[PDB]
Amino acid sequence: MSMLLQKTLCIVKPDGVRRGLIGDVVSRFERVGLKMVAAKMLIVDESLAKKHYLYDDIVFRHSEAVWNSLIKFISNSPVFTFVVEGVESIEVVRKLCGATEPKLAIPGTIRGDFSYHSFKYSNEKGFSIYNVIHASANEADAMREIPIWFKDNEILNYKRDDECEHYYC
Amino acid sequence: SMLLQKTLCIVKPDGVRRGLIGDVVSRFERVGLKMVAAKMLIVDESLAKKHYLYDDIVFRHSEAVWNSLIKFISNSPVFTFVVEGVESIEVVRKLCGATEPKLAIPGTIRGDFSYHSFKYSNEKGFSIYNVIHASANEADAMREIPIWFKDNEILNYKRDDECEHYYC
Amino acid sequence: LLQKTLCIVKPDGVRRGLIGDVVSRFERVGLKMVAAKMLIVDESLAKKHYLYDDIVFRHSEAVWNSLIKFISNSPVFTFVVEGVESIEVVRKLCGATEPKLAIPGTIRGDFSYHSFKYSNEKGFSIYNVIHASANEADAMREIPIWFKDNEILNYKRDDECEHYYC
Amino acid sequence: MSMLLQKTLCIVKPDGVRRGLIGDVVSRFERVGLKMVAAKMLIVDESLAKKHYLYDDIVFRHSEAVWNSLIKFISNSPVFTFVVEGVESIEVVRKLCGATEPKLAIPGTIRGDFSYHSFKYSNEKGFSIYNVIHASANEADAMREIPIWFKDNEILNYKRDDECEHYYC
Amino acid sequence: SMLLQKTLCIVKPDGVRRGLIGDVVSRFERVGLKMVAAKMLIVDESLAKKHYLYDDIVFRHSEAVWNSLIKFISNSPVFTFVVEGVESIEVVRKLCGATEPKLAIPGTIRGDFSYHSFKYSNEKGFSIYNVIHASANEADAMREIPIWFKDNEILNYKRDDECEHYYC
Amino acid sequence: MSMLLQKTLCIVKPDGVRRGLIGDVVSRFERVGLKMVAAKMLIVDESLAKKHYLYDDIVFRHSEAVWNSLIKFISNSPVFTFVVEGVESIEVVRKLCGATEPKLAIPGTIRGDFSYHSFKYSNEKGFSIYNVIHASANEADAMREIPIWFKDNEILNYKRDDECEHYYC
């Protein structure tokens, strides 16, 4: 009904997966009242990694080296990918993940509570930052990212028992 | 000490119906604040209208805002309790986080357990459902507490960690 | 099959800041809180909850006295829990009366540990965090002692359909 | 590879999903060291339900009414299905779940902590037990159940960071 | 009182390398047991051979089990600590759960944090990795404690909840 | 060995110890990925307290009254002292601990989650602030503080199983 209802793509990254953090992550979203409407576990291949992190954009905004480092992090590695639905969910999910850099991420956030290392370190070592989770940055990103990971028939429609407390009935 | 305060907290109908009473109380016990009063009740219209004063809310907000506050809590279960400690009113405000769940910082009661927005609540014609009420300030705590609790329902006892918070 | 059962966070529970922890255990399995109040128990009220004639027969005057001394003039948190066969379920979540023996996972097993041998030696009651009504009759007796009829709430938890079925 | 290494099929049932318990459930398994090797969320149609709850198995072990109840409970309702890998994982998963009947499930298990209602009440009402989770009862069930929910390419091969502590290295 | 006991605990190298020290300590603090000593160290071969005595282990089990225990803890990090309480030895055994993680009941340390079996450990030629060690009985605690701690490393102090466990 | 790897001294103060908070505190550090590399529990004698809180250092930054109240809080009382290693750990530990004053300390942090009282109240009562934990303020304090509590051979070298997610491999 309302235009404020959004879906956002979330990925528990390989660092997160290998550390056994998928549950901890999902609970955070379930706990505030956000609804999981799709989920899959997969090994990401190069091709899919290249659709998710677009060369043209990442190179425009950062560098080819940053893009290489994102691709190497995620390619041929396991991820847990899911879609979260709710009132202004893109913004709220950004709020819950915390700052991109775990060193700066505030305690209480996913990144703040589960990771700590710094961009300065990751740049020195020539790796991407390992910051547990990806979340669609904004509306245009979510509209692009979701269909890359999910077919339309993998987006589920149902009611959480607490729906009336979040959407009103 | 003049610094010792009591504040009134209410787990609102949304927190109750969601089974969050325990979760909320633990947040306060865990920092070292003391529960000195508690009761559970269905709030009647008349009690609702005393907690949320028409003249106050209207002035600071509007009639639609007051009405939706009354509609939310009236004929609905709440868990009401009083908390004591050093500058407790402020501390409690800090633990609850911002009025608007969308903005409440993770780590806060509202940030961890709710998420929706004033923008959404204004569109649908409902109050924000933000889990908990806490007295915004001292004059409010003094007015609100006697509304929910008789003087003989406020407890005096020592928490075992009292020497760590009040000193001994 | 729907039942109400009387629970009390005892003064050790209250003084250690465990009210929330205890309440959460019940809310988490799906049980509904339908009454709550906090108070200082006076001897008068303590002697009604722990009946002399009952406890003396079943244990002794010393034991009854220790019970009375434990709660008299101390803070408790009392609440009523509702659900399908809740009395037995609450018993299960509390664990054995004796913390030493209570199984991890249970309220008593997780939050306390001392033994009956120790309490007999010191002349104190067992401090085991929580009271829960032992059976149907004890609850029908206990609830009215702590709560008036109008203090017992009727409402729907949002997860009700998962427990009572709708 | 040891013959003791097993995969088992788990489902967070519609009651668990509607209650926002997915994360809580997964965490319990990640926390002991079991490894998630596949996951998906879907609305279960009747035919998939009838593949998972086989008419002949359920009517042998129980009754036709119970089969219908099992089907009515999961059909047209969301589930989160995943596969767990580890040393003797089928037994371990069953221990983690606790007794089929939540009323009897020991505190500390998934069913013990997150549900409480009984068969007596389930029978009286005409509904299946709402017991949060399904886990494969034994090796033969796990072998049958997995390909029902997952294709071979959706089962993942990776190493958890704590692997050495569970499998040895 | 002769019911008051001290017991020796060790977060084994699997628990240390997995970051479980805090998780384990909390389980003990939460029930009311008191931490009265703590040290972290790399266990040298010689100290390992004092904690797991050849004669005891070979008699009950085998030389192969003993070797495996020594290889598990030698030149590896551990967190050792001593817990005090009313019948603490028994209570600590209960909180740890069964020696074999596969059988360890959920709610226990070993039941919540580990899961593999003796069958597997025996097949692979390794010690069971079961997170924690605790003295099995009073004789063992009396033996094991002075092996890890000097008398002056055992602390005398009051927990704030003392009166709920020891009485006052 | 990147120069960004740091060691920092932490102390659960007598308030945290007497309250049974040691476990909860250590967990916050382990959970983000920081490594414990030293630990001991001891009764602090007056002499040790004066080495740790330096008269001249504390007098010029606060006052004499404050130094006295720091000495009295810690002397002849139990502490649990430990060393944390990780990338830029000094800053990270300070982020996790929160503001010196519990009243202001933000929720999600050790101090904001476990204490609450104020500098106004502590000054008024004549006592130190009771704030659960001490962490080294900077590289220099850390360098000075560690050897006061630990001898060189009490600092341990080993790998956390998640090391590659934090340090890379």
Q: Exposed, middle or buried, F102 (CB in 10 Å: 0-12/13-18/19+)?
A: buried
Rg of chain C (C-alpha set): 16
Contacts of B19 in chain C (CB under 8 A): 27-28, 30, 157-159
Q: Rounded to a whole number, what is the distance in Å from the CA of A5 to chain D's nearest CA?
A: 19
Neighboring chain C residues of E32 at a CB cutoff of 8 Å: 111-114
- Any bridge partners for residue F44, and if so which? F77
Alpha-carbon gap, residue D48 to B53, rounded angstroms: 56
Which of D72, D67, D27 minimizes the C-alpha distance to D45? D72
Whole-angstrom distance, CA of residue A91 vs CA of residue A85? 12
CB C93, CB C25: distance < 8 Å: yes
Compute the distance between CA of residue E16 and CA of residue E77 in angstroms, rounded to an integer: 7
Task: Give the span between the Cα atoms of B30 and B24, in whole angstroms.
Answer: 10
Question: CA Rg, chain F, in Å?
Answer: 16
Min Cα separation C74/chain B (Å): 7
Nearest CA-CA distance, residue A167 and chain D, Å:
15
d(CA A118, CA A109) in angstroms, rounded, equals 16
Neighbours of D60 (CB within 10 A): 9
Q: Which residue has the tokens 């204490």?
A: F115
Quick one: CA torsion of D135, E131, E23, B164, rounded to 10 degrees?
150
Distance of alpha carbon D96 from alpha carbon B2, whole angstroms? 52
- Residue from the list F28, F32, F91 with its beta carbon closest to the beta carbon of A115: F32
Q: Quick one: DSSP state of residue D153?
A: G
Are the beta carbons of A79 and A14 closer than 8 angstroms? yes
Q: What dihedral angle (degrees, nearest 10) is formed by the CA atoms of F122, F127, F132, F136?
A: 100
Q: Which residue of B has its CA nearest to A160?
A: B18
Bin D168: left if φ > 0, else alpha if -120 < ψ < 50, else beta. left
How far is it, in rounded angstroms, from Cα F2 to Cα D136? 48
Nearest to E107 among D4, D108, D162 (CB): D108
Beta pairing partners, E165: none
Cβ pair F12, E38 in contact under 8 A: no
**Helix or strand (DSSP H, E) at C35:** strand C32-41
CA distances from B64 to A121, B123, B124 (A): 53, 12, 12
Q: Across the strands, what pairs with C5?
A: C81
Largest CA distance in chain F: 53
| Ligand-binding site membership of C157 (annotated) | no
Residues counted in chain F: 169
Q: Are E135 and E56 in contact (CB under 8 A)?
A: no
Question: Chains meeting A at 3+ CB pairs closer than 8 A?
Answer: B, C, D, F
Residue D45 carries which DSSP code? Answer: -
Query: CA-nearest residue of chain A to F98?
Result: A107
Sign of torsion over alpha carbons F86, F88, F89, F90: positive
Tell if the CB–CB gap between E114 and D32 is shorter than 8 Å.
yes
Which of C74, C64, C63, C80 is CA-nearest to residue C8?
C80
Give the residue among F65, F50, B165 at the shortest CA–CA distance from C17.
B165
- C74, C49, C73, C64: which is closest to C123 by C-alpha? C64
- Runs of H (alpha helix) within A33-109: 46-52, 55-61, 64-74, 89-97
CB E115 within 8 Å of CB E128:
no
E165, closest residue in chain B (CA to CA) = B160
Ranges assigned E (strand) in chain E: 4-11, 34-43, 76-86, 132-134
Q: How large is the C-alpha radius of gyration of chain E?
A: 16
B164/E164 touch (CB, cutoff 8 Å), yes or no? no
Distances (CA, A) of B106 to A76, A92, A136, D53, E34: 33, 10, 19, 42, 32
3-state secondary structure of B85: strand
Give the amino acid at E126.
F
Helices C19-29 and B21-31 meet at what angle, rounded to 10? 160
Would you call C104 exposed, middle or buried from its count of C-beta atoms within 10 A (0-12, 13-18, 19+)?
Answer: buried
- Method of elucidation: X-ray
Residue F162 with chain D: CB contacts under 8 Å: 161-162
Task: List residues bridging with C35 in a β-sheet.
Answer: C80
Question: Which amino acid, one-letter code, is at D3?
Answer: M
List the single residue in B1, B86, B95 with the smallest CB-CB distance to F107: B95
Angle at A154 between CA A148 and CA A155, to 5 degrees: 90
Instruction: Report whether F120 belongs to an annotated binding site.
Output: no
- Long-range (24+ apart) CB contacts under 8 A made by B118-125 are B119/A4, B119/A88, B120/A2, B120/A4, B120/A87, B120/A88, B121/B68, B123/A2, B123/A4, B124/A2, B124/A168, B125/B64, B125/B68
Tokens of F10: 């932490």
Q: Do B22 and C27 touch (CB under 8 A)?
A: yes
What's the helix, strand, coil split of chain E in %, to 5? 50, 20, 35
In terms of Cα–Cα distance, which of F76, C153, C121 is closest to E156? F76
What tokens appear for C65 in the block?
């006295």
| Cβ pair B102, B118 in contact under 8 A | yes
SS3 of residue E159 by DSSP: coil
Taking an 8 Å cut-off on Cβ atoms, the answer to whether C161 and A161 are in contact is: yes
B5: chain F residues, CB-CB within 8 Å: none
* B30, B91, B164: residue with CB nearest F103: B91
CB E33 within 8 A of CB E91: yes
Fold of B1-168: Alpha-Beta Plaits (3.30.70)
Handedness of CA B128, B133, B139, B145 (dihedral sign): positive
Residues of C in contact with A169 (CB under 8 A): none
d(CA E9, CA D161): 25
How far apart (Å, rounded) are the C-alpha atoms in residues C15 and E32? 13
Both structure tokens of E163: 């009166």
CA distance F19 to chain A (A): 22
In one letter, which amino acid is E142?
M
B99 labelled ligand-binding: yes
> Cβ–Cβ of D92/E102 closer than 8 Å?
yes
Structure-token match 């309250």, residue found: F19
Euclidean distance between CA atoms D71 and D47, whole angstroms = 9
At F103, is the secondary structure helix, strand, or coil? coil
| Amino acid sitting at position D78 | P
* Nearest-angstrom CA–CA distance, A3 and A89: 12
Mutate to test the interface with C, among D13, D114, D117, D124 (most CBs of C within 10 A): D117
Contact D162, E13 (CB under 8 A): no
Substitution target in C27, C158, C161 with the highest count of A β-carbons within 10 Å is C158
Q: Which residues of E touch B160 (CB under 8 A)?
A: 160-161, 163-164
- CB spacing of B26 vs C25 below 8 angstroms: no
Secondary structure of residue A99 in the 3-state scheme: coil
A42, D18, D49, D62, E102 from D145: Cα distances, Å: 19, 23, 11, 19, 23
Query: Which among C53, C48, C58, C55 is positioned nearest to C143, based on CA atoms?
Result: C48
Mutate to test the interface with A, among B120, B128, B132 (most CBs of A within 10 A): B120
Residue A96's contacts (CB-CB under 8 Å, 6 or more residues apart) are A28, A29, A32, A109, A110, B106
Q: Tell me if F13 is assigned to a ligand binding site.
A: yes
Count H helices and E strands in chain C, helices first.
Answer: 10, 4
Helices (H), B32-106: 45-51, 54-60, 63-73, 88-96
The response to whether F109 counts as a known ligand-binding position is no
Q: Are strands B132-134 and E34-43 parallel, antiparallel or unpaired?
A: unpaired
Q: Which of E18, D167, D31, F33 is nearest to A20 (CA)?
A: D31
Q: Is B94 exposed, middle or buried (0-12, 13-18, 19+ CB in 10 A)?
A: buried
Q: Is the dihedral of CA C110, C116, C120, C121 positive or negative?
A: negative
Q: Which of B82, B58, B72, B57 is nearest to B156 (CA)?
A: B82
Residues of C in contact with E1 (CB under 8 A): 118, 121-122
- List the binding residues of D for ATP: 13, 94, 100, 111, 131
> In whole angstroms, how far apart are CA F1 and each of A50, A67, C2, D27, E159?
32, 26, 65, 34, 42
Q: What are phi and psi of D86, to 5 degrees?
A: 175, 175
Q: Is the dihedral of CA F89, A136, D41, A77 positive or negative?
A: negative
The type of residue at D127 is: F
> Which of C2, C1, C25, C7 lies closest to C138, judged by CA?
C7
Residue A80 near residue F50, CB atoms below 8 Å: no
Q: Are B19 and C34 in contact (CB < 8 Å)? A: no
Tokens standing for residue E50: 């004092």
Query: H or E segment at E118?
Result: helix E118-124
Strand boundaries in E49-162, DSSP class E: 76-86, 132-134
| Inter-residue contact B107 to F123 (CB < 8 Å) | no
Q: From the CA of F153, how many Å to the nearest CA of chain B?
A: 35
Q: Where are the domains of chain C?
A: 1-166
Q: What b/e sequence results for E46-78 when a residue is b if at least 16 CB atoms lie within 10 Å of its CB, and e otherwise?
A: eebbebbeeeebeeeeeeebbbbbbebbbebbb
Q: Cα torsion for F46, F49, F51, F57, to the nearest 10°?
A: -120
Sign of CA dihedral A52, A55, A61, A63: positive
As a whole number of angstroms, the distance between CA B125 and CA B68 comes to: 7
| Contact call for F114 and B167, based on CB within 8 A | no
DSSP code per residue over C68-107: HHHHTTEEEEEEEEEEETHHHHHHHHH--SSTTTSPTTSH
Q: Which positions ≥6 away from D115 have C-beta within 8 Å?
A: C29, C30, C162, C163, D15, D102, D105, D130, D131, D132
Chain B contacts to C (CB-CB under 8 A): 16-30, 32, 35-42, 76-77, 79, 81, 153, 155-161
Residue E88 corresponds to which amino acid? Answer: S
CB count within 10 Å of CB B55 equals 8
Q: Chain F closest CA to D22's CA: distance in Å?
A: 21
Task: Calculate the dihedral angle through the C-alpha atoms of F125, F131, F133, F136, rounding to the nearest 10 degrees.
Answer: -80
Q: Which CATH class is domain A1-169?
A: alpha beta
B139-160 per-residue burial string, b: 16 or more CB within 10 A, e: under 16: eebeebbeebbeeebebebebb
Using a CB–CB cut-off of 8 Å, the residues of A that contact C are 161-162, 164-165
Q: Which residue of E has its CA nearest to B161?
A: E160
Q: Are C81 and C131 in contact (CB under 8 A)?
A: no
Residue F148 neighbours by CB distance under 10 Å: 11
| C114 labelled catalytic | no
Residues of C with CB below 8 A from D103's CB? 84-85, 88-89
Which chains does chain E touch, 3 or more C-beta pairs < 8 A?
B, C, D, F
Residues with Cβ within 8 Å of residue A146, at least 6 apart in sequence: A7, A9, A83, A136, A155
Q: Which of E64, E70, E79 shows the shortest CA–CA distance to E48?
A: E70
> Which string of b and e fits D92-111 if b means at least 16 CB within 10 Å?
bbbbbbbeebbbbbbbbbbb
Query: Which CATH superfamily does the domain covering C1-166 fall into?
Result: Nucleoside diphosphate kinase-like domain (3.30.70.141)
**What is the amino acid identity at position D79?**
V
Where do the H-state alpha helices sit in D14-152?
14-18, 22-32, 46-52, 55-61, 64-74, 89-97, 110-114, 119-125, 139-149
Q: Is the CB of residue A43 less than 8 Å from the CB of residue D152?
A: no
Rounded CA-CA distance C151/B38 in Å is 12
CB C4 within 8 A of CB C82: yes
- Gap between the Cα atoms of F33 and F160, Å rounded: 9
Structural contact between residues B41 and C153, judged by C-beta atoms closer than 8 angstroms:
yes
E20/E10 Cα distance (integer angstroms):
12
Residues of chain E with Cβ-Cβ distance to F42 below 8 Å are 153, 155
Smallest CA–CA distance, residue E86 to chain F, in Å, is 17
| Positive or negative: CA dihedral B92, B94, B96, B100 | positive
